[PDB]
RNA sequence: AAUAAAAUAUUACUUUGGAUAGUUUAGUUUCCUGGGCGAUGAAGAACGCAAUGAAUUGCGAUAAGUGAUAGGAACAAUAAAAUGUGAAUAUCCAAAAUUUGAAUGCUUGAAAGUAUACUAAGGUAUAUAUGAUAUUCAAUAUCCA
RNA sequence: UUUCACUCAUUUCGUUAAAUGUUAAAAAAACAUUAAAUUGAAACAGGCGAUUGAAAGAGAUAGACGGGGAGUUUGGCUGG
RNA sequence: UGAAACUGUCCUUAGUGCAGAUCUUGGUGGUAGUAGCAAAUACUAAGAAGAGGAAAAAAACAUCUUAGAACUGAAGAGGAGAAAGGUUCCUAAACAACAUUACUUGGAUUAGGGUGAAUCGAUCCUAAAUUACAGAUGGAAAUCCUUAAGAAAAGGAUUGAAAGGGAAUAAGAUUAAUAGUUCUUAAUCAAGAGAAAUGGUAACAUAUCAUGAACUUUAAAAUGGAGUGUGAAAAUCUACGGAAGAGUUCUCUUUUCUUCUUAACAAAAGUAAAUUCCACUGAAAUGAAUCAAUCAGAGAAGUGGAAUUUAUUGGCUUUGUAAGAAAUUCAAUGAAUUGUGGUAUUUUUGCAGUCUUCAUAAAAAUUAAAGGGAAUCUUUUGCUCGUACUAAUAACCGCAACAGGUCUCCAAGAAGCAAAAUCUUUAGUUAAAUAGAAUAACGCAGGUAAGGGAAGUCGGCAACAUAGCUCUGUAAGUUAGCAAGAAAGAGUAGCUCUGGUGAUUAUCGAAUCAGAACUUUAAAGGUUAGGGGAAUCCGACUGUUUAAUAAAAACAUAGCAUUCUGAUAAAUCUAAAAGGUUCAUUACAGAAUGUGAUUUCUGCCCAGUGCUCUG
RNA sequence: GAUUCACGCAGUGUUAACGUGCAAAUUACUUGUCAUAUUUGAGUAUAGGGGCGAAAGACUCAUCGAACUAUCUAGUAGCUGG
């Protein structure tokens, strides 16, 4: 919605911030298995239900 | 079985009174010294239509027998009242239409309305359209007077109970035949949810005691004891008689 | 014809959401917000619309000059001139009758 | 244009900008970004020119 | 029309985020949280819901102060 | 009557699949010691913090860490700076500890806020019930001039 | 034990708990207040004013009624 | 082959031997390169970019520009909002996966950027309703009560609307994207700072003026719907006069098309419609007036005045703002123009009376006025939060780019009674689960057909047929209202003319009706557009109904009838309750039932079972 | 609470299309209806032997002659399968 509460908007912003992949340098660490973020989502695939 | 419609009426969820546009509580003013031992004069400012009831309401304005200001009252109109009329309430009020007098001062045979069943309870009896009660006789030994209720029953009240002289306005309301289902729908605009009434025989055995089988019929007598539990008390209750009256 | 759009975020044809479409430089048409139609004053007794007072919103009366929100007369602004004349005669005639009826008849 | 804490109002930002750079401020508009930071548009007085402040700060 | 067609008007939220438990279980009309049992002072826990106990209880969070005291 | 294109059968090699074998920083059970939370604000939730971080871990406007005491030369994916005048690392210690939550000035929906007093902005106190003491009152409730 | 009289628990009510009790002394849709000169604007009761009233309500025990409702049953053989 | 553990015998122990349980979990076949990738009219040529049109036609080629041809058709496939979504918005790099072929495209990957308010909203007020301390109830959890019970709250606590109420902002320009929010210009609002007035007969009037406390009252905020008439603005159309540009032009066309505009807030040259009041006078031979009404000795008509309303000041033209903007042209930043009208249609917004209800169609915050007489222009500041984007044949809900569903605002021409069907302008798009060739059967969708005309079939199912407007004409039956558009018949085109219906005082203007010669392919029919009649049954009617096999004769209904109740009652919810519903009520009422409009009529039975008795 | 057309809406018929669908109920034409017993948005109230029902045992989140969810519970089975 165009209209939202202040606290709700910030919780929206965090979900945007958390929708990112692994940085390249973290992928080059020794003994690294975290190559992709399996908690990722896209607007047209899964609704975050909030 | 289920819970029948009369059982669901006592919970008051959708059956609550549709009283949002009502004017207010219509009653006499609170009793005081000036009504017990004198007369207070009121002015009929206007006559208004109260939703949900067939009689008009008068916006009387007494002054303030003890303080400064106005005492805006809300009476039930007696037939013949007009705007700008003066009405007097008290024990010494004259016997005129619209005046409020204790039921002991009214001569036997006087027609009153909006009578108090108990002294100072601000009106109980004879409050519907065109209705009235007649003073039968007095009894100065115990300060009681006999009146004839609009249903025909006789009731004995204290001689100091207040009443308004005249006839409640708007009489002859129910003689006009409703013609359409829609008109009856509009009648309950400011009343409870009761109108479209499904016959018990058209229901199912779960819904109603009358809910029948392969032929629409009751099956058992429709006259029931007063002691029947809520749920099976459907039909005529404690019927001393049945059939067309002669 | 030039078609227009609501400027505020209300989207329903409510009483407070009335609009006017007026022309503007370049042939474009813009949207205004028009004020609701209000009632005036009424005599306290006869319920008739008083003359001399504009029909505006209640708060706009404070903006008007001190002389433009009333009528220079006894009970001016709350009672019509006919309403007032009956008041004077009642106050004088009843009082005069009381002096003759009672009070050394 | 500055990025400021959300818990600061327009009056606090105007005073803070004046104290930090010794200038005059006439108008402040603030918008809170999605991430949570508050973007402030501080317009200086006409006599003070913002090109000298930008180079003094180091934006250029 | 009890299937596909009736789901067109589903655009009015029943539950919103709660303030004590953080889940989307705050009933708007009932003014209560279905999960953590809001304004009710005690946290809503049931013995039939044994799994719901192990999902939110002591030790499932940060334990910011209790971890120091017990180690103390 | 003839064909071996398809079909069928065996073996070798390769492929899709992840069985089998070898293995374990994970579990299960029993036993021993304790069973040490909170108005001095707990458990839980939310948000934020790394030079390059999305999760996770740790932490709280002093932020993947501060002081103190031990500790003795590292960390690293890539740079930087610091470093025997003390790097990592450890802690029932010290300071510090955002918004909430029994949540407790009032309100709280996803709500932005806001009242008074004390010491503009900041920080404290003010919920309900209750024990003791102090002080101010109410009721001829009992006497009583 | 029944029939009475009362109120004092009790019930049902009404108001700004606004003159209770006992002594004393329909011509007019208008205004009515912050008093002039302790009185003016009287005193007291151990009842805020009525109403019901030892009856009725709620409890215990006992009889009746009670598909409104709960639990359950509706044998076997058998040219199906 | 494999690269680090393992085996044989004796006892002991057991989670100890699989082909089945529609067994459980995982993987994989034939079907099978099969069924499909067919609603939404549709694409083509040249060029650019790219590895990505090659070739013995490999007949098809994604994106962008231009041209042609088209569709949505302004109740839109247009321009914007509420909810819901949550970064899908803009740009650049890039195409492994995804959009049933492909994609250089993308609502897809990667990285950046993006949401600016004193005036718009939230915040403030209360509606239906909701929730506290104390009190009452409960074994308990908890329930009730919302001002009644209170040493609480002049009077009653919390919450409840981004569609109800509400202090105050507009035009132009600007960004890859935000704009009543930024910039320029021009305004407004709130809170602050520097013995007490005249005029008019009267209705009433005076750039702040011209004192006005407690207390009380009145009004506003704040009130249904229908239909008729009419004021004003805008759009469309049109009359006269032009200025600039564009299109057609070997056939003509003094031609056809485009532009000619103006805000908030204020001013007061000129000038309106309607309603209500005031003064003079007193109406009958009764008058005045509307489309309709309606009104008058508690005073008409007339004349002269006052007030209010008409999208801000004061309604319209006009003025300031303001032409310096903007639009259309021209030259290479600088120049030109920017009249006046209409007895036409629609929309919007007011006003006036009329009709209708057993319907009478909110409250508070907040503001002003009155009765009363207590007391003696400049300037500062305006905080917190939302603001991007879609709003749907691709951004929401249905597992998805699903032919389903989802609340609103603005609204051009033709033709017509019509917001109908059909076509077009402004805007949008040519892609929206792939195409090319051939033109078998059997299909789905749309059609026609000789002669006959329901002989087909359970049944005229399906299809055919009637269809607009004018005039003539119209039965039985009937609740006298209807049937009725009954049935039935005739006319209708094009062109050239004729006449009727007014305004103003000779000039001007409206679509509407009637009539006459002539011609032809003999005329509503492109589209839109009733088949009709004679009877029987059921239900009186309008209405509702088994979401997803029953829309009906079933339910409702008005009407009729019966039963109980004087309110401390009847019905009835609750474990309980100064608890709750009808009830803001009071027998013309409340509660419980049967029948089902109207007409005509409801016969006999009280033994049986109920109900009841004043016994 | 007259007759009709339109924006819309429903679901009479074809018992048409489709029936491993566009769709876990839709599409096309025909039909009916299309403002007062009308249509519709948001808020609010009513809860499982309960609610709500112009009454079909209908509706109560694709679940209704008693919803969904978890515990008793590995409920019992003279019956079927291994």
From Swiss-Prot, chain B:
S-adenosyl-L-methionine listed as a keyword: no
GO molecular function, one term: structural constituent of ribosome
Subcellular location: Cytoplasm
Any one cellular-component term (Gene Ontology): cytosolic large ribosomal subunit
Domain of life: Eukaryota
Keywords per UniProt: Cytoplasm, Ribonucleoprotein, Ribosomal protein
Transmembrane segments: none
Renumbered residue ranges of the record's region Disordered: 206-246
SUPFAM superfamilies hit by this protein: Nucleic acid-binding proteins, Translation proteins SH3-like domain
Summary of subunit composition and partner proteins: Component of the large ribosomal subunit.
Function: Component of the large ribosomal subunit. The ribosome is a large ribonucleoprotein complex responsible for the synthesis of proteins in the cell.
Family recorded in the similarity comment: Belongs to the universal ribosomal protein uL2 family.
HAMAP family: Ribosomal_uL2_A (MF_01320_A)
Name assigned to this protein: Large ribosomal subunit protein uL2
């Amino acid at each position: 919605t165009g209209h939202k509460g202040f606290s709700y908007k910030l919780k929206l912003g965090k979900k945007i911030h958390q929708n990112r992949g692994v940085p390249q340098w973290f992928r080059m660490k020794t003994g690294n298995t975290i190559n992709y973020n399996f908690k990722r989502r896209h607007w047209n695939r899964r609704k975050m239900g909030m | 079985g289920r819970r029948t419609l009369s059982q669901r009426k006592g919970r008051g969820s959708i059956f609550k009174s549709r009283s949002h546009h009502k004017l207010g509580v219509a009653q006499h003013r609170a009793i005081d010294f000036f009504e017990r031992h004198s007369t207070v004069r009121g002015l009929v400012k206007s006559i208004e239509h109260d939703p949900g009831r067939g009689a008009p309401l008068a916006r009387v304005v007494f002054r303030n027998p003890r303080q400064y200001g106005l005492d805006k009252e809300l009476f039930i109109c007696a037939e013949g009242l007009y705007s700008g009329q003066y009405i007097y309430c008290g024990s010494k009020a004259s016997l005129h239409i619209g005046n409020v007098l204790p039921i002991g001062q009214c001569p036997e045979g006087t027609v009153v309305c909006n009578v108090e069943s108990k002294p100072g309870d601000r009106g109980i009896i004879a409050r519907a359209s065109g209705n009235y009660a007649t003073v039968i006789s007095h009894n100065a030994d115990n300060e009681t007077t006999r009146i004839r209720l609009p249903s025909g029953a006789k009731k004995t009240l204290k001689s100091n109970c207040r009443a308004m002289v005249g006839i409640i306005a708007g009489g002859g309301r129910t003689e006009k035949p409703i013609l359409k289902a829609g008109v009856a729908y509009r009648m309950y605009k400011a009343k409870r949810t009761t109108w479209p009434r499904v016959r018990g025989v058209a229901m199912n055995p779960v819904d109603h005691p009358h809910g029948g089988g392969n032929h629409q019929h009751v099956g058992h007598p429709t006259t029931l004891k007063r002691s029947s539990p809520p749920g099976q008390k459907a039909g005529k209750v404690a019927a001393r008689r049945t059939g067309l009256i002669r | 014809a030039v078609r227009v759009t609501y400027v505020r975020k209300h989207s329903y044809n409510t009483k407070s959401n009335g609009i006017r479409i007026v022309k503007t430089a370049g042939g474009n048409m813009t949207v205004q917000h028009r004020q609701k139609i209000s009632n005036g004053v009424r005599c306290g007794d006869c319920g008739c619309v008083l003359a001399g007072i504009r029909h505006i919103r209640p708060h706009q009366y404070g903006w008007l000059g001190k002389s433009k929100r009333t009528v220079t007369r006894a009970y001016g602004g709350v009672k019509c001139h006919k309403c007032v004349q009956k008041k004077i005669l009642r106050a004088f005639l009843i009082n005069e009758h009381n002096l003759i009826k009672l009070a050394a008849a | 244009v500055f990025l400021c804490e959300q818990k600061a109002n327009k009056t606090m930002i105007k005073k803070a900008v004046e104290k930090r750079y010794g200038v005059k401020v006439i108008k402040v508009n603030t918008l809170v970004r999605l991430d949570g930071l508050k973007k402030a548009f501080v317009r200086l007085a006409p006599d003070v020119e913002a090109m000298e402040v930008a180079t003094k700060i180091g934006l250029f | 029309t009890k299937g596909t067609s009736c789901r067109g008007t589903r655009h009015n939220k029943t539950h919103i985020l709660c303030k004590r438990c953080g889940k989307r279980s705050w009933h708007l009309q009932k003014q209560r949280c279905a999960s953590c049992g809001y304004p009710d002072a005690k946290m809503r826990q049931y013995a039939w819901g044994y799994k719901a106990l192990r999902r939110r209880t002591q030790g499932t969070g940060r334990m910011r102060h209790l971890k120091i005291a017990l180690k103390r």
